[PDB]
Amino acid sequence: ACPEDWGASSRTSLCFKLYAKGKHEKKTWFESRDFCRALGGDLASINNKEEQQTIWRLITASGSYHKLFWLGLTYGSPSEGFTWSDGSPVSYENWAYGEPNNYQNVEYCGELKGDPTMSWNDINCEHLNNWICQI
Ligand SMILES: OC[C@H]1O[C@H](O)[C@@H](O)[C@@H](O)[C@@H]1O
Numbered sequence: 846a847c848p849e850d851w852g853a854s855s856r857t858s859l860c861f862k863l864y865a866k867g868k869h870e871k872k873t874w875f876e877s878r879d880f881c882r883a884l885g886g887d888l889a890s891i892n893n894k895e896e897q898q899t900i901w902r903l904i905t906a907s908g909s910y911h912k913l914f915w916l917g918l919t920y921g922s923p924s925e926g927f928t929w930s931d932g933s934p935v936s937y938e939n940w941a942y943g944e945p946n947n948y949q950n951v952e953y954c955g956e957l958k959g960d961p962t963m964s965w966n967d968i969n970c971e972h973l974n975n976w977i978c979q980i
């Protein structure tokens with residue numbers, strides 16, 4: 846069962862929470878990771894298409910679209926490439942077309958574009974974004 850406001854009560858329920866913030870309260874990737882970890886969780890990993898649908902439905906209920914959210918995507922070693930901060934394997938992927946492109950060699954964190962495509966992009970880790978936690 847999920848904590849109240851994070852999802853449903855069944856044993857198979859997965860728990861996510863959107864953090865949409867104004868520009869003075871958006872966070873870098875590391876700040877967002879630390880925020881979710883302080884609650885006992887982490888930035889959201891999206892391990893399969895079922896979790897993608899869960900998050901998309903939360904976005905539809907939010908009223909807003911087109912917002913950029915940090916996910917738990919962070920580059921590891923050159924041989925690893927992208928990893929999830931929660932340690933789970935990056936098996937499922939939904940990178941946007943041409944991504945990750947490491948544009949200008951300075952993009953080591955991953956963001957979700959909260960549109961129907963639900964696509965991922967690598968971007969500068971020091972950008973201030975909204976974020977999604979999991980527990
Ligand atoms: O702003 C940086 C951002 O610009 C464009 O959208 C693309 O090149 C992306 O791959 C890149 O991450």
Ligand SMILES: [Ca+2]
Binds near residue numbers: 945946947952
């Ligand atoms: Ca990119």
